[PDB]
Each structure stands twice: as C-alpha cells, then as structure tokens.
Amino acid sequence: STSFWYANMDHTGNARGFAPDLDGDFSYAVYKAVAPGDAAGIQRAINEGTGGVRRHGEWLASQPRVVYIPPGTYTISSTIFMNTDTILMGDATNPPVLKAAAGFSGNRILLDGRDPSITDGRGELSFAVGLKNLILDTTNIQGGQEFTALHWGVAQVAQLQNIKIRMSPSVSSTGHTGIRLTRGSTLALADVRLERGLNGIWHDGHQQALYKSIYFYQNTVGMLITNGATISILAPTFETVGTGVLCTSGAPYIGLVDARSINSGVTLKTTTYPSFLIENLNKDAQSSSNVAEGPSGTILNNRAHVDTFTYGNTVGRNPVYGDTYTTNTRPPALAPGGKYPVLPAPNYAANTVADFINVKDPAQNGGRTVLGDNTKDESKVLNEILQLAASTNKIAYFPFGKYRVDDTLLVPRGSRIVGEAWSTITGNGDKFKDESNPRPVVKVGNAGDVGVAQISDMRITISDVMPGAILIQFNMAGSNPGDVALWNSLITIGGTRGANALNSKCKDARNECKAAFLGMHFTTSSSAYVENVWNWVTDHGTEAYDSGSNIAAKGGALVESTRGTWLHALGSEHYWLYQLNLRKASNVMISLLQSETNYDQGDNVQQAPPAPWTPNVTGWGDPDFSWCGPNDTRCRMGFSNYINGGSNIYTYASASWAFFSGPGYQNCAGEFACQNHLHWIEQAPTNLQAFGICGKGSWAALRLAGGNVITSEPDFKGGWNGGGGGSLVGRYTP
Amino acid sequence: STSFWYANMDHTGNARGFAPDLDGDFSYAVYKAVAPGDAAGIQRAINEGTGGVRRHGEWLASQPRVVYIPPGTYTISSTIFMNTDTILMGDATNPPVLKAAAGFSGNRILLDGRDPSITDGRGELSFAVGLKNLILDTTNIQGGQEFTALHWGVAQVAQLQNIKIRMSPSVSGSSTGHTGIRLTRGSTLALADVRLERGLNGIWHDGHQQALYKSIYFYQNTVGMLITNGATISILAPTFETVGTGVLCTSGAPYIGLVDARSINSGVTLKTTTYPSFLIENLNKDAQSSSNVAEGPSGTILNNRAHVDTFTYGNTVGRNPVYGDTYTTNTRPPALAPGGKYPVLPAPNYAANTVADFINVKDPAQNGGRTVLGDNTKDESKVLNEILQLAASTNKIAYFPFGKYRVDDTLLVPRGSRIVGEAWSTITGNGDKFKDESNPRPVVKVGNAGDVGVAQISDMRITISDVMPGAILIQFNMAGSNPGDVALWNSLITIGGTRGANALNSKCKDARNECKAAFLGMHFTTSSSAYVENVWNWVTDHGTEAYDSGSNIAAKGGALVESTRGTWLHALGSEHYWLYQLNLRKASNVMISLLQSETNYDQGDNVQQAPPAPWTPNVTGWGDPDFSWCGPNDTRCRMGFSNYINGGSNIYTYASASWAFFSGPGYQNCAGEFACQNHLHWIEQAPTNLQAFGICGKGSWAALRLAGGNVITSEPDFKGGWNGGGGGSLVGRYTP
C-alpha cells in the first residue's frame, strides 16, 4: 500500500500489540485494516473481536482497537458509531475521505464519537475515542438541512488529530454543523479545520472543552454555544466567518485568547449574560465589525488589537458584572513573540518505519527481549532501548501492552515516544513504597537536562499500593516550548485491569489506600508542555471487575518549575489533598484545568483529610488543613487550585466540579453546599492573571491569600447550570 | 392484500388524515405503507416527509406517522429507530415478523423505541411511540450473546398492543443472553398484553422511573423480569409459565407490586439481593411450582404456598420494625373484582372487523352525507354529535382519521359507542361556552347521567385551544354492565405544549398571573363506572413542536373521581395541575394499579403565584383543597397534591409514582433532598376499607399525611424508591 509508518509496523508476529487481562484470550487483534473503499468495513473493524465475539463497550484501556483506513473515498450511508478505547487511524500521507452519501438515511450524523452501548446518553463515560488523519465530507447533503458531521459528546482521553471537515455552504435557521458537543466531559479538541456550513462547532451543554488551534474557514457561525459551563478557545483563526462566537443560551465562561480574525464579522456575540475574556485578539482591516455585542448593545467596538478585555464577574469591581480593560506583558519565556505556544500532536506523517525503533523487535532494539504482558520486570531492558533510540535519533514506538517496571524508567534527552492506543507503563514493587523517598515511575530527563522529550498516546499507571510513587516527573527543560511535551495521554490509578494487588487493597472508605505520592511532578528546573492529558484516580470500575475506588493518592499535579510550564486541558481528578498545586512556580500558563473532588470526600466522609496522609508543608508544599476543625469535613476536602506564591501565573479556565458529599454517591445539602473551597490562594503570587475560575457545589468561589473569601453567591454565580450551583470568577487580576 | 380495516381505510382523497399547522404543508401523508418483505422501507416510512424533507423529531402530536406493515417476514440487519408521534401498525389479521438477521451489525438492538434525535439519552421526552400487531424475533442470534429485541426507554403515550417477542433459549451458566424489553431512562406509563418467549430476561427494568406491566405473559424465560434500579414497578395479572425466576431485583430499592399473578411450573416468584419494598397480592400457584414465593438477602421471606392473599415486605405504617413482613386478608368488592380478579382488558385492535363495520367520520357516504373537515378551521360540534349518535345507533365503530376537530360545545359520546383514532386524532374545545367557571362544561362527555352501556375510546387526543376556566376536558357519566364497557385506552388529555392553540399559548406566558386554562382534566361522576388504561393527563411544562410555548398554566384539577361504582385506573398519568393531580371525593370502589404524577414546575418556595390562586377553592361544591392549613406565604405547603383522598370507601391503590423536581419557575433547584414539597400524598378524610400500597414520592418532606393530621415523615424510616431512597419516599403498606 503506502509507506505510512503505522500500517507498516508489525501487527502479526511477536512485535504486535498484545492485550493481557482478557480472560485467557491471547489472540485478540488490536489492529484492524479496512479495505480501500470499503465503507461498511469501518464499523466492522470497530466492533469485531476474537472469534466472532463483539468487543466490550465502555472499557477504558484493556481492549484497545486501532482501525487503519487506507487513502480513498468511503461513501457513508448511515451513522458510524465509535467504541470507547478505539482509534480511527487514517493514512497520514494521504488522509481518507469519509463522505456522507446523497441518500443518507437515519439520524443526520456522519460520525458519533459516543459509544452506543452507554445507557441514557452519558457522554461523560465515553472515554478514549480517537480520530486521526481523516477528512469528513458532507457536501453531498443540501446546505439548508440540519446535519452534523461529527457528534463529540464524549469524555476524557478523546482526541482529534489532523482532522478536516468540509460542509455545504449554509442557506435559514438550519444547516450543517461540524462538531456538535452534547453531554460529555472531554478535555481538548486540537488542530481541526472546519470549512463552511452553518456552525463550525456547536457546544450544546457540554460541561467543558479547550478548543486549541481551530481553523474556522467560511463558517456562518464559528462556534455556536447553546449551553455549557466552561469554554476555552486558544489560538483560533476566523477566516470569512459571519460571527466568531455566538452564545444564545446559558451563562458559561468563554475564553478567547490569541485569536486571529480574517475578513470576519462580530467576534463574540451573546443574547444572554455569560462572562467572557478576549486577550490578544488581532483583527485585519476587512474585519470592521464590533468585537463584542450583548443584549444591551455594543460591548467593545471595532479595534484591530485588543489587550485584556473581560466582561463578567470580576473581583473588586462595582458592579461585579461588567467590562474591564487592562494591558499585560506576557513573559517572553512563557509567550515567545507575545503568543503562547501551541503545538499539534505529532503524527509522523513523513516518517517511515526506518525512522522508528519498535521496542519489541529484537532486530531493532539491540537484540533485547520485550514482552509487554505484565508478567515480569522490564525496567532495565526498556531504559536501555529508550537511551538507544534517543542516541540514534529514532522514534521509540511502543506497541500496545502492559510494560511492568520495578524501577524508574528514564526518558533521556532527545526522546520521541509514541504508543499504540495508549500503551501502558505500570509501576510495581517495593522501590515505590517508601513515602520518605518518593520515586518516579516515568522520569522525563535528569535534573538539569535540556533537550527534546516528546511523548504521545501512552498510559502510565501502578499495579500495587505504592505510597512513594510519582507516576511521571518532569525534570527536563526544552530549548523551545514543546521540546519537552506530553500529548494525548492518561495517568490513572485503579479502574482498569492489570492491578490486582491495588484492586484488593482499596475497598475500604474508612482506610483509603495510599496508592501514590503524586500523579505528576514538575521540578524547579523543568519546562514541560502538556496537552489533553487525564490525571485520574478512579471513581468507578470500567472493565467489568470488582474495582474498588476508595483510594487516597496525596496529590495530583505538583508544579514547582520556574522556567516555564504550559498546561493545555489537563484533567486532574479525585486526588486526596489537591488536584493542582503550584508551589513557588514562576512561569505557568493554563489554558484549561479540569478537576473533580474525590467522591468519598464531603460532609459524610469516613476518613477526614489529610488522613491517611501526614502533610509535609516544608518539604513538599502540602496543604495541612490546619485551618479546619478536626471534624469539619466540608472544610477538609481536596482543592482544585492550590496556588502557593511564585510569580507570572496565568490561568485562563478552571472547570472544577463537586458532586457528592460522601461514599455511595451521597447528595450534598444544597446546590452550593458540597464543598467550601475549591480554589484557594495560600500566598499571593507576583503578577497573577486569573480568568474563568469556575466551580460547582462550592460555598466560596475563590479564597485569597490573606484569608478573604469571595462567596459564590450572590454576585459570583455562573457557569455550571447557569448558576444553579455554579461559580464563576471571570476576572481576578490582583 | 388483506381485509385489515386500517389498511383499507381511505388514505387518499378527502377522508384521509390531515395534519394542520404544518407551516403551509397541506400534502403531508400521515399514512405510509411498507412493501411486503421490504425491511429497509420500515425506517424510510418512519422518517419520510413532504417533498424529501425529513419528519420532525421530538414532536408530540402535530406530525404523526402511522406505518402499515403487511404480513410477511422482514429480515433486519441493524437497529430500527422509532420517532416520537409514530406508530408501527402491523396487519392485525396476520401480524408481520420483524426478524433480526444472522449477521446483525451494530449495537445489538433490533428495535429502539427512543427517538435518536433526542439528545443526551432523555427517554422521558420520547413521547407517543406506538407498536401494534408485531412479532419480534431474535432466534437467528445465538442465545449466549447479549441482545435486546426492544429498547423501551421511552415516555408517556407510548403503547404496546398485541406484541409477541420470540427469543433464543438462554444458555445454562451464562450471565449474558437475550432480553425482550429493556427499559432504560424514561417515564412511560403502561406496557400491555405482551407475550415474551424464552431468552434470559423477558423484561429488564434498568433504571426506568415507573411502569405498569399489565397482562404480561412470561413464557419459558430464565428470568421473568429483571429489575436493576428504578422507583415504582407495578405488575398486574402476569403469567409465569416454566420460568426460572419470576421477578429478580439485584440493584436499587424500588417498589415492586405483584397483583393477580399466576405461576405455572415456575421457580421463585420474587427474589432480591437488595432491600426493596414489595407486595404480593392474589398469587395463585400450581402444584409444580414448589419453590419459595419470596427470597431476600437474609434467606427465605415467604415459603411455598399455592395461594397468597396480601403479603408485604417493606416500609409499613404502624409496624414496630418499619421494614418487615405483614400478612393480611382482604375481601375485594365483587363490583371491583368480579370473580376475585381485577378486570384487565386488552386495547381493541378490531382484528376481525372490516371497513364495513366502521364509519369513517369524514366520508359523506358513510356518516349520513355530512361535511367534516378535521382541519381546526370551524366548529364541528353538531356535525360530530350527529355522526356519533349515528354510529352508536347503528352498532358501527366510529373511526376518526387524524386531524384537529374543533368543537364549540360538548361532544357527547352516546350509549353503544366505539371510537378509535388514527395516531391520536384530536378533539379541541373552544368558545365562550367553556369559559364560565360557575357552569363548567365537558369538552368530551362520555354518556349522560345514569346511562349504562358501552363507550370505548382508544388512540385519541382531547385538548383545548384557548383559556377556558370552565372546561372539563373529559367527563365520564355512564357505567358499564361489565368493567371495561366504558373504557379509555392509549390516549392523551393535554393542555398546551402543542400547535393549534395560539390563543391559549399567548395568554399563559406570565408566572405571576397563571392562566386559568381549564377547570378539570378528567371527571368521574357519582353514577359512573369507567375503565382507564395508559392515559396521559398533562398540563404542559415545555413546548414540544418548535413554537412559542406558553407554559405558565393553572389548570385547577387533574382527575376528580366521585364515582361510587367501580372505577379502575391502570397507569393514569396526571401531571402539572394546580391544586391536585388525582382527587378521590367520597368515591366508592376504586382500584388504581399505577398513578404517575408530577407537581407543577412553577410551584415551590420560589413560586410567583401561591396556590390556590388564581383559583378560589370550592370545597362544598367540588371538593377542592383550600390550603387553609398553610400560612398565606408558606409556599412549600401550598403545592399541588398528587394523592388527595377525601373519605369514601373501598379504595385500593397499588402504586403511586409521584415526583416533585423544582422549587419555582426556571427549573430552580430545591432546598434539599426532601425539601421540594411538604405533602405529596394527603388523606383528608379516612375512607372505610382503605388499602394503600407503593406510595412513592420524591423530594417531599412527608411520605403520607393521615386524616387526623398525623404526618409520616420520609426520614428516617420511609426512604426508598426514587434514587434508592436518596430523596425518594416509599410507603410500602398503609392498611388501617
């Protein structure tokens, strides 16, 4: 066929992806190839399993399927339905066209990312749906009819990579929609080009999403926002677009940062009362329309350049809801050239198999035997292959598997790592059980390293209760932002097969297991780029087994870097003390942080935090909760944002939700009574620019360093459920 | 070509069904016919509209589609998706077989009743999905694989009529297998007269809010009904033949009602691994059914007895352990239960009747040379009263093709009437004759006072087109010689929410001044004896058909029952009325197998017009609650009742699905889990021989209020039902 690197990798033989924990099935095919032009074969490859048994729906990581679609045109006559943990991989050298037929029958959706096996449309459970190197075409459908090329009501670990959507020109209240997001909890939509139609993206009640580097080309409306909580749009381009962003319902947060307007109309228009920010908008001469318009008329007139304009709930303003214009000079290390760094996930479209090292092939990795079946320690053998590929400038390809490591797996300078449907590194052993000497499972460079370390399509996890485990630690800094990067990956604790020892020790809410020390760590001399990454302590089982979810992992993400750190849609959920900790960091940019308090915590918790952990304030910057009464359990809940000093902190959207008050999915007292403090500033940083700090079920919308509290009600409401339990700090620029 | 009455009705010409208010489309075809054996044509007929435009999804009543499927076998290779306001009508003289192909591709669902155009899996909005005279067959699929013949995550006005589901035999030792009817998220009313053959599960009730399963035949199922979570389950007159386990509840804490059940060579009748509240009344077992009747987490609950009178195991009023067993004996009145069994009747399909036995009300050659339009352009009261008397006096069935028949006076349904519609043909009241609340007048009158005879209506809709404070939408006056002679099946009674009522929708857009749209939805007078099954009594809460929908409506009362003869309510949904949803005013001999209700959404702490306003209560004349016990600004107390029982005798209620959701206009949240309402179920005067079971509630502080003023609090001992007790009430037994 072609020379596309993935299709030419060994998918038979010993170097193929191998799936353990499949109930004795050692013949399951991770890889399937569709015949050229075989449109019916796309759905077949998605669902087909071993010996005629259909694949499991709703599973997260153990039964992955990558469907290779060769170049060509595939005429689609009815909706194609994805499965969880499934990737459609078109040929990157010549992406295939999935074209809707003229006689398209059924629901007017070309591709549905939501697994049909989920009941009651729970998109927040449709994890790990991937689309790569595809062209969606609906030009055979009349532009006046309602149609949706892609329904993206999905959850985390879902990804878009090198996707193009051609639609018919709009006519009419109905028309083509490129990507419609209904119920779901996804993280990032990256590098999608939407051509024509009525709506390029329709955000219909999706909780939150970061839209990174989206190209809106000749859309009647760039993004339609009907309902939803937190919307972050980073580095978009509006070319011949009638209206950039149109929000006709709800009170969400809308973040438009580093936007470009090419011969377009109004950039942000709303008929309701959302809180939005426009930072670094650059308009051309043909874009002569107002920048912002609302129910009362013009909000911001025609300006070719906008610095920092908010219109929403702002701290210190009389009245709270209103306009504010400021100018801020971004640090050149954070924003080279005034623009924050945005990079597409690598697809290696021009690379062939020779540019890679298949870690399992003895002819490629230096004559080493690698299993990836979670039956033995493979740390040393994998540290040697990773150092070999970096020293020879080869990309290290991990076929799918579960690679058990009993010591740190170092990612050395010059590494480019890519996996097959989130190949899994799992830590194990006594070397990660010393909480007095915490140890990284995956270490990205040594202390003081400068170089390239790019990782994509991987998973890191643990197999036992390991109170000293740091799942990934970033030590290396890049020469340019993105040299050290992590794309489209997940870091999980529990919830998946392959961790029996961990699964047996975490079934008691009275003694929550000390599974890990940290999920992610960014050391002081590091400089890392993170996009579409799920940092998740399990709340429920995903792969049909008694999963146990009473886990006390101390901290989710600890950022100590003073060089520069960019977090594009990082989901950090269900850790004990905090989801995001900024400990004396000095150059941090956050385009979206998605977080959720641990479900076992709240008024009816059985073990009050910080227990079972003893906080180390001096050594690791833990919150000690010494301000709460020893039995004030609404006060002793994990923080979503714990900002502790430092400088040059830019956060542009925080989707932090509280749902329950204790084990068993117990309800909270009220809409704003699940938690007291989700967002907490311990020490005021120098040059802090915070926008879109959203919450759910929190009494306070933000806590300031001196102890002052910004209450969610009555004037800092918004976002989740339009304010029915939702917090919104649209502007905090102290 | 057969002699089926519906397929041989005029579907061209002037007597065809006509859909008004379709944005200038006067050629829309309500009726579509599938070619024999054309499986692909079934989906086409569901969605096809005028001139290549697809039909509207989610719509309730204005764009109906009836799909006629001739006899034959239809090999289905992928899931068929229904639409709202859509009926699949197989040939009643020879039902067609919808057979899943051996190479079935997709999610492994043969037929999905839930409209795919609804977003976020909201089955509670999938209204008016009908299936008639069909055989669903999954025998080409191996019995060891998970498969679902019918997904019924739907909402009210959905109906099953003469449906049989054949499945492959389950595999011994296998946890997966065929499921006949799976109910996920949704709010349907009744599933009637379905025969389920083989498979692993005949019915899987997976989180559905509530459902009445009437006259279900479980034939050789490994498990009759599986219940994984849910609130209120009522099973009336089932038959378990060669069934391994009758009812198996492995998750949740629902209410399960088993009444008039038959066991033929079956295993355990009700087994649970959790703590639901169930009732088993009038279970009659054969000799070969030697298993225990009920089994729970602690072991045996009720051992093998061939006959069970009244056994409850749940939250019971007056018990010192609230949760526990109770055995009593009750002699049902012969007028309520002739022969000891409650009356259950299938909805009439007229399978043996031809066109000659019918009167098409629009055909001048059949109705006496009268001009009938059905386009909501003029008053058609006199012309329709004369046709109904004509069809009754000539022993003919009156067939209403679809339309909107405006009436400016009462439309009398006389003695001997049999009325059937085409996808819920609509009678809409109008005029000044329904606007004098001091002289309320029925829109549709079922017989005169003191009449005895047959008056059977099915597949119809009754509504109003303006604000009519004196309008009774349907009033039952006549009694039957046998129960079911006066009956109403598979219908809707709606106020607002649908196109065709511009004057009404324009006057009901202010929550500060709630419009007095109607006096009563349904009325059962003292000398009446009516049978009601699968009927939606609905004051609108939101718009359904893409139009400016005013939903700030104060319709006084939903259903007022004053009858002292027999009255049977099988899955009556009464929703969003102002003062009450169901009022039993000195009624005698009343049987309710399931009542589904919802408090008006504008009511609660943040209400803008405190009840009884804008209504002045008439306690003496009409038995309204005046809410004089509440402080004039205690707004959680001044909320509409779901059950308002006021005196009388011989009242048997077996399931109450009564939900409160919001605290004011705008879908505002409530103060707490049990803080939406104070009283959902209220006894004003204690009746003689009152037998109450399965009184479920949501978000109300009290689970039940007694005549003396004593209150049975939902917490701590009467939790259960909705969300397993997380805000759900459950009075499993109140038998004073």
Numbering used by the authors:
A (entry chain A): 17 to 187, 190 to 752
B (entry chain B): 17 to 752
Paper quotes:
Here, we investigated the mechanism of endo-type action on laminarin by GH55 endo-β-1,3-glucanase MnLam55A, identified from Microdochium nivale. MnLam55A was identified from extracellular proteins of a phytopathogenic fungus Microdochium nivale, which infects grasses and cereals and causes pink snow mold. NMR analysis of the initial degradation of laminarin revealed that MnLam55A preferentially cleaved the nonreducing terminal β1-3-linkage of the laminarioligosaccharide moiety at the reducing end side of the main chain β1-6-linkage.
The solved structure contains two molecules of MnLam55A in the asymmetric unit. As the plus subsites for the binding of longer oligosaccharides, the aromatic residues suggested in SacteLam55A (Trp-196 at subsite +2 and Tyr-194 at subsite +5) and those on the putative substrate binding groove in PcLam55A (Tyr-135, Phe-199, and Trp-245) are not observed in MnLam55A. On the contrary, MnLam55A has an open cleft, extending from subsite −2 toward the nonreducing part-binding site, to place 3-hydroxy group of the d-glucosyl residue in subsite −2 toward an open space on the cleft in the docking model. The cleft-forming residues of N-domain, Trp-75, Thr-135, and Leu-141 of MnLam55A, are conserved well in other endo-β-1,3-glucanase sequences, which suggests their importance for the formation of minus subsites. The smaller size of C5-L3 in the structure probably allows the localization of C6-L3 appropriately for the formation of the extended cleft and possible subsites.
